[model samples]
Target chain A: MGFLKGKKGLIVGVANNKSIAYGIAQSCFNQGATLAFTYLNESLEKRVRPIAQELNSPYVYELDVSKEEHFKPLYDSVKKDLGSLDFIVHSVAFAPKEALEGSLLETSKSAFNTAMEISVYSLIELTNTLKPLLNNGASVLTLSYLGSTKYMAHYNVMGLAKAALESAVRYLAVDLGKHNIRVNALSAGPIRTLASSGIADFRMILKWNEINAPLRKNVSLEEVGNAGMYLLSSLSSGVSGEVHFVDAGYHVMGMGAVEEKDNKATLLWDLH
Target chain B: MGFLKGKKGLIVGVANNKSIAYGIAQSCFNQGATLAFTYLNESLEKRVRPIAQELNSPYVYELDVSKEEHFKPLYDSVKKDLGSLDFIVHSVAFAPKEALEGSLLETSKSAFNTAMEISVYSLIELTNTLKPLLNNGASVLTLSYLGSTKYMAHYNVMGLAKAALESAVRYLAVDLGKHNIRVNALSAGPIRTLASSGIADFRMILKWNEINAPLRKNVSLEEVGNAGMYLLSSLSSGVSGEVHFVDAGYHVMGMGAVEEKDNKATLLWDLHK
Candidate 1:
């Protein structure tokens, strides 16, 4: 029997067959989680429904997180449908075009509020809704970025939204630990997901990663999915409110990506 | 001109003659900056005002940070009465009666919000009002604790508030950097202060210093204050959005305080690095 032989899981944001959420769903299915899924709307349902079928998941439903109606009842219906949940993921985030495309000062208040409400506050709302059905030692995981705490150019208000998201993880961890539940955010470096599609200078970060990352390669969605499995499983039971980076130790260096500065110093030219 | 010469600085939360802010104020005054001070209320004023006068700062005032209106105009009036600021020392924080008694989860939400608003958000409201008067390359310094990130017991909601406060410093650094202003936090380890008197397990943490800390001594308030002087002045022009710890290398250990499950049965057990 797999570690999750009788356990059930829910992967909440499957946009298409080739999405990060799908990577997680596939891994959890391999680990024998009786999987359920939620798609955003009708447009995504057309794609997600097929992916759920591919994973042999019997429960696929629409969970537009922006609406209170969908968030409150998602876990209950899933509990009734799939039985007790061992783990649940919060992988949904949205931002208006202008909020992400412009400087943070230029971001309108409505855009900031809407983006934070969806990206930051929804994690709390979801976990609260699911608190009843989550088994002891159940894990609550969310997606975050280095941009959450750092100033990544071209990632403005969304960075603040993710900052709030990471803090929410900590506060929720303290609150939810009464039942032995764990909460964590797995921070993956820049990947070309549907969310990352429109980011200006997106490829520049990839090239920077290719140069600086210790692994010297951008992360595969499968690697992040594997990390999700690690955090959700028993190996990481003591961990809570931690942001595990799957970007190959990139966060450690203060002056990373400036390795050329080292080479420039050692050109063997005593020009002085 | 050494950047801060003849400039005015307002130091808050100084309790006694040997306070941490006293260390920073000495360094600041030595570098030619004039200084002002705030005692917590009338009771502390009797104790702290005399100390400020010793630093050539007779302009001591009363600041109750729980009152938000006390912050904004004080800086503006300082600008109007004295001069445009080159720096600020936001060494102020507090919590209620129940904050320091037990586990973090046991703390109240009202306590959490109060701690953040006073200890953390007060800095935000200060910078919001002081942004105009601040010269290019101005520094804003605040005090923080190791409990902000670690599971320091009895630290309670102050840790969470400091976590948010530290994040706010980073975001504020990015926001204010265009104007050449800097924001940073000095994370000091456990020290006996008027504020630290509130924590229940204070003696245990103090003993923890004698064992694990690399220098093997608790940090003096002066050391932290001098470190803040460097951070706030032009000596650290490249640094921002970072929390510099003054805790004698204690922060490096992953599992401090616990003797790492030593297998004495099979090994020589006497190797010291």
Candidate 2:
């Protein structure tokens, strides 16, 4: 019944029930894969622990990616407990609060570094550090957004981070492909989560996507999870180095006038 | 003055110099590349003859991509005339008029095959036909749009065609990478060209893009031209199998609640009454 019946996976970045990673974990769990999870600190541990239990995973580890020391223990636990792994879901990313509130040009160097290192470099560090525990045919999936290549209001430095992250996918795809390991990124539509809540204009961004996406709606966590499952499973073995969009076809819009009224152009969704 | 100085290229699908292929040809010409041209039929030859002359060589040939018979003569003649090639710009695509304005599920099989063959399969056929002529490190580029991967209203079958075209780029990139040949697609923003004239909502699509794009404007032929030139040149040596957007950052936007004024939401562009 499960495509991933005998597989094992480690998912990073589950902050709450709303986290995209949490949804991915749920999808993976239902697909019969044994799962391991991570939380940033004790505060999130309270939230993540229950989620881990719900998924039947007792192997939740603390991995504040900002703290280099945290990775070793997480690796050791996976090695000692879960043994070797078949897939990884790296959904980690961050930037200082000020970074998402202003212009990309005004983003401070430190904030930029904080964003790039955590959001972009963590994938590199985690995969290489966990290389020994990863099976040869393993798949590594990372989460990204449309901001990587386009200019979104208030997306700012995270856009640059996703861009570099995408380029890293290509570079890593080549490097990892050498060992028969695959790497890819999923550019999901925005969902209201602890991370997205920080963007000052987050609500407006959501409204626009709902009205404009080809599907005429913002995507659900379940939808992103199902597509994410495909990338993380053998269903997508031939795909690599791709930034597969799960944004309800919103990325395809060049301009709007999607709906018409009496043969003249008109906005379809009413805001007020 | 030109990045492509000393390079030689064959540009297919030039309906006119006002064509995107023409824009690319001008960009390549300004950058100092010796060029070749193609026409779909004898009628187009009259228009293409002067364009070939203006570029300062008589290397024009007939290439009706829909016809299986046209490729060999073009290839054989190119081998005799240019001897070797450095880059190829495939700015070709098509679909029936009826297919562009309806639901994708309703598209007929004949229309689907025509769109896929003329728009998507032509790239594979062009590249394979010209493979031996392509120099080591040679680059090949095809024009694409957001429709291939995303749904745009009235862009039905062409979107599926483009989606397949993009997939072909990836498969070809991996195969040709071993031979040091690069394959890529430039997803150009909407422009009013001979090709785009067929889409039912073309005017509305243009207006919407200009108002909504991050740069607050639609991209110009020259902007797409320069970006296309980059991919075809060594400047983009590291890039391959990518669907690079040249659409004034419009592709990045998820929707249009962009600007705010007086503590009320507003679009950045001023609307007309």
Candidate 3:
């Protein structure tokens, strides 16, 4: 009846209902997926447990990627509870508030390493740890942003993290393809999330994208939810190792949109 | 009914039936759009004339982009023949043969300039020259390759040229969006064409892509042709300033495909070697 009917998936990084991971989880659940969820620590567990229940999931695991000890239990819990996974949605990423707000040149070694380790290396570790439990044709997906290849103000070090993360997707795609497993990333447009609030001038970025994107609006959670479902389902059988954009066509704009009025060109943002 | 029914378009590069531009023209023609064609020189005219006639396109003109003098006449001929244009396909690109076989560091200034002038500047010049004649909501499509952003062995200076061309598409998309004109580039996978034969070890590149691409095959001309038709048609009204890949998902791969036998990983290409 649904694309992901009777499938089992592991959803990482649903900090709250507004998280992109939550969006993907909702779509997957709506499509009849039996989901397993994870939270970073005790603080997030209260938030995550309720969500897991709402989605008809009974399995909730604690995973702080910084704590290497947490992985084994997560693997064992998934193995005992879900037996094997049909798909994995990794929406984890982070940087210090200071690193995100300042010049990229001012980033410290610790900040850079932390961003790469949490945002980039976590995918590799998670996949490798769960590699034994992944069913044939299992899909592993991660989140990425446009700033990975292009410059975006206040996106600083997280941009570098995303670039590394996307490369990881490609490498992993090739590595796992022989096993009939797939890996891909989705670079979604700007949205108001618990994670995104860390980026400075985020409101302006949202406003700018809504104005300039070809669709003349920002992408909604439901839109990205549906796209994420497609990527995770059998409908995208021909696709692998791709970094699909679900950004309301915002990445296509080379510059700000302009309007021609009486033979004169005026910037759309200026008029706004 | 065809999506491009009643549309009039111009196709700038078509050396033979094997040409990607030729494939696009055939698709567009089959979809009910009238087409105008161009030939670079006398030698190519013999090849182009029959093809134009086969597609029922009576409008053919001479256009060698390097020749600045040819623009006015091309504009004039199209104005008289088709009256206006609904879409344009610019599939032109070139570089010195030596440049494609050598190291990027050794590329000479002359070769770099030649590649950019022929491949990159031609789009800007062609669009501007024919700007007045383009109908509202008209689309412009160009051809590009994966080499533009990533390193491909022996792609050399043409890679740089495509990079500029993609950037130009973005800039032009924004500049022209106000006028309701859309500009986009299609980065197709390796295919044997008169243009691609110039790349050294093209056979190896084609084989590699076929083996490694997600679809396990190189893109066909018809596949790219249909994709081109989509960009040139109203079906893709929400897409612009985009560099869409129709490469059988080849660009997504970070490395070669591997096969596991007896729990050992073997490079797929090594088996062939």
Candidate 4:
């Protein structure tokens, strides 16, 4: 028996077999979790089904989160179809074309609304909907990037949305503590994912991850997958409402990549 | 001329002369930013007026951030009154009694809403409204604590709110960077603030600060003030969305209240093996 020998989980936002959600799903299955997945549209369904089948997802469903109505029913089905969920892997987010490409100032009201709605509001909707079925000591994981806090070129409103999504994790952890459900965000370093490939300066950020990250490489799906499993397990029972970084310790450096002398430039001048 | 000789800015959430806000105001004024402040209520107005006067507040206003209606007017007045605001010091926050006193599980919905709205949402509202008035190379500052991400007694939901606030700071810094507006949070270690006094377990946290903090002592307000000034000044132009910790490096502790004997614990575990 693995860590989650008898557990059941719902892994959402698998656009393709290569998505971060897929990595998390494979790990959960290795630890003996019966898994379910949500595909954004029929196009995604074609790709996600085989992966879900590999993981023994007796149930896979269409959860078009762009429409709010999709949330309640999707979660309801997860309860009825997959059995009570012991954990949730939430690697879901999106941004409109304008919000992604244009200056943040150029963002229109609709793009802002859409970005916040899909990229952020979905987490709150899913967490609250699934709270009742969350077996005590449940774990909820979400995907995030360092861009949410750093000036990563071309990661605009989506970055803001991730910020809000992260906040929801903390508040949900506190509000749901009585139920013993834990919420956390795993901020992975830049990887060549379908989601990140759309970013304007993805190459530069990846290079920074290679040069500056303490682990000195872009994070692998296996690395974050392992960290996510530990967090989902009882190993991190004390950790909740935390952003457990699986970013190869890149978050620890301030200006080490640009300044070969290390983070001296970012450290206080007097200290240096 | 003060260290702020070339600067001018607005200060929000000054309850009275003895507040952390006041200390920040004094430091900014001493360094050279022509300063202004907001009084939370009339009672504070009567007191903060003199201190603002002493710091040469050419303009001071009354702002109640708890009231949503107050935000727009405050933003409008900053434009009409101050013309251009170079920096902002956000030190506003509130938590209902139940939220503070109750366990995280026992927290009320209304209390949870109020605590987050006041402590977390207010920063977003202020920054969003003031974005237009903020000058290039401007700075935005907010206060936070390690408890937001850690388990601290009596800090319950408030810890969650501060974590939200800190995350918001990072995203804001990233989004606003094109305009050169720098945003950051100062994770000050335990200090006896008018707000922190509600924490009945303050003494225990203080003891931990003294024992575990690398400096082997509690942090002083001046140290925090200097850190704030560094972020506010051009010295920290490269730093944004970063938490500049000034708590004597207490945050670096891997474990324990003091340096424990390594071999003793190892011997105990070895015997078991």
Candidate 5:
């Protein structure tokens, strides 16, 4: 039952039980991997430790990708505690509240840099910094959104960040392919998580996705976790540089969904 | 400048210059490929001739895919005129207006068969029928829409047809890959062509894509034309089975565009087109 038995991984960006990273950690742990967790600041660390302990991990570390000094200490501790890694989950992302609620054209240079550094460049930094501790054939997963390539209202700056991050995945896959390290991004559909709460009009987006998606529903954290777990495990060894969608087939839609109403075709939203 | 130089390609489904097939042919012609054009019926032939003559080709043929006898005569004729092919562009698709405006579940069996045979099966038939004339390493191109995988309002049966066509691309890529051939689909953003006019509320769809696309605009025929040329030419030699989006990055968007108003965020559509 454990596809990842005897594996060790470093899971960055676990905020709470409602976090997508937390779900990923739970999936990885359930599949039998020793996990090391991280927190952005003290407030998040307090919540993250219990999760680590619940998953049988005492290896908690501070990793503010914004800070220059935190990476080395975490890298040292990961080597000291976990010794080496079979996989790494980079789910960290952030943006200024104003930036997340505005037009892409109006995004300030500071907000743009912050989003790119935290959400995009951090992946490259983590992989390279943690390179010494990664085992051969280890898998790496970074989270992405549909906004990366498409226009999503208010996803503005983060959309650009995800696009660059996906492109980085392609380059990194080629770079890491030589070392037998797999790299991929999981473009999960909207889920109600602590991080997603930052986006404006998020509920409406979720409702729209639920109605428009072919499955006629929103994806659960567990569903995304299963797909993420597949990419992080050897099951997806053949797939690299892939931006796999776990959006309940919502990504395949060209427009709002249609349904039959009183023998006439109607938009699902109109019917709702 | 000439990426398709010294190449020969058959351009099918060209009704007029406004056709997406016409844009693709223009790109290939500009890049220096000897081309052959096709007309569906006598009605389309008059329009197709000027476009073919404009591209400097006399190799226009009648190719109503529904006609059982057209394929062999065209094959024999093509062998006599152009002799061989390096690429093929398929841009034919149709569905009853009623079928397109209705629910997918409400589609009549006749409508479904007609759409599939014309849109999906024709690609397979075109490839297999023209196989003898195609050289090794030839690329096959098809046109698709975002509706194929995703539900598009009022794109009902055509969506299913595009979906099947895309799957056929994957299968053909593998089957033909052994011969070093490639197959790909260009999922262009909506352009106001004769075919797209059949869909209900198409203007709104076009505006939505324009406002929501990453570039904050709709794609031009030239943009899609340039991208198509790359896929058809040897520049994309390593690629196969790719449903490449030339939709101004609209396919990446999960929702409509957003704008900041008087200290508040609102959907772009709420303010203006």
Candidate 6:
């Protein structure tokens, strides 16, 4: 039997097969979880519905987190269709393209509010809206990045949003722990998701992570998928309010990686 | 066979049985690793020697990180006694008690330098001094706390020292990785070590973590020891340059814990007073 046998989950933000949420959904589905999927708009609905079908999930709904009106119907639809949820994956984040491509000092207040509302507030709203439907021992997860605590090039306002989101996870964990529900965030290594495409110097960041990460390679979708599955399952029962890293151990690095050439230590980046 | 079978490790910083290094030494010895221990001075030597004998270790040396004269002797002794090493645990940190009891702004430059040199730079000096003797695939670990990233009431300058120490772990990890030597830090939850007696309001901080942590408790010495053993052993071969937390998941907390009492939510701290 699979780890998630007889479990039900809701996966928000599966824009395409390349999406981190899609990987998580696939892993959960493979582990026998009955899942429901969400799409942001008509264009995304086209992509998400096919994924839901591929995973054998007939339940798909539209959810634009910025539109406050979307939450009620999503909650109602989930209760009417899936009955209850054992886990929820909130892998949603966004900022204006301009906000990500410029300096943090250049980010406008409107862009700041937009990033926080759409990326951070959505998790809180979604959890509170669906609180009644969450089973005891239920788990909730969201995605994060290294930029939240340490500065990363071009991550900008999303970093602030993620910092706030991580704090919220801690707050929510304590609040929800009374009811036996766990909350966490997974700070995955940089992946070429539809959302990450907005960041400037994306290629450089990817290359840097690939080389400097302890594994000396970037994490694959399945690797992150397995780690996410661990957090969502009973295997991580004692873990809560944690920001687990699945970045090939990259978070631990304090400097650029080096290598030995001709018996002399040389910067790997210099070669790159 | 245990995870650390045939492994030789040097543990620096066991002042007493309550010390984190003592817990780690016990765990490593239980896992079949041969060990050597260090004492800071005469008073500590009296306590450390008995513990070493209890663990069936005959090699004990004097190491005062601030003493530049001590490193060469330590290296010579380790090379002469243990021959080669598979792991080193540097669980040492110190700050002037006056610095911790006061504000960071009031901390003098000398206190900052002392904290950084003794707590942070000592790791670099220790590792570099023993580099020739460290076997390939050797692991090095040090201790840290939550205050490095976030604010804690009395942690003060030691917080800055730890921030530098963590960054040093990253840099040292990359530099050492080329030699197949791994570097890491373990940020454990607060425990009542002799060093911790210097921090003001220790009892309150302990109670706060116990109530707010997701596990709803503080981590024990054995728990941190087991986690440390995992990082020091080949079971975590794929991991490097990491700061693993063994804090009962306490570091994740961002708010005070609340509980429903008489059908009303109340702060757990309020009940404590």
The clash count for each model shown is 0, 0, 0, 8, 8, 1
Tens digit per residue, CA lDDT, model 1, B90-178: 88777885886555567788887787788888888777867887888888888887778755545568877888889989999999999
Off by over 4 Å in 4: A193-200, A258-272, B1-273
What is candidate 1's local distance difference test score? 0.74
Which structure is stronger by TM-score: 4 or 5? 5
Model 3 chain B, poorest ten-residue lDDT window?
A: B254-263
DockQ of each: 0.02, 0.28, 0.02, 0.02, 0.36, 0.02
How much is B268 displaced in model 3, in angstroms? 51
- Which candidate comes out best when scored by TM-score? 5
> How far off is residue B239 in model 4, in Å?
21
In model 5, which runs have C-alpha deviations exceeding 4 angstroms?
A1-6, A106-110, A174-180, A193-199, A234-240, A262-264, B1-62, B71-91, B95-117, B120-143, B148-150, B153-157, B160-252, B261-264, B268-273
Per-residue accuracy of model 3 over B119-139 as CA lDDT, tens digit each? 999999999999999999899
- DockQ for model 6 equals 0.02
Worst 10 residues of 2 chain A by lDDT: A263-272
lDDT of 6 by residue, B82-182 (tens): 99999999998999987876568899889889999999999999999999999988999999998788656567899899999999999999999999999
lDDT of 4: 0.76
Off by over 4 Å in 1: A192-200, A258-263, A266-272, B1-273
Q: Which ten residues in a row have the lowest lDDT in candidate 4 chain A?
A: A263-272
Per residue, candidate 4 scores C-alpha lDDT tens digits across A159-264 of 7898888888889889988788888889887676666666435654565467656677788888778888877877778889998788878765522322213212
Question: Model 2: how large is the Cα RMSD against the reference?
Answer: 6.1
| lDDT, candidate 2, at B252 | 67
Candidate 3 displacement at residue B215 in angstroms: 42
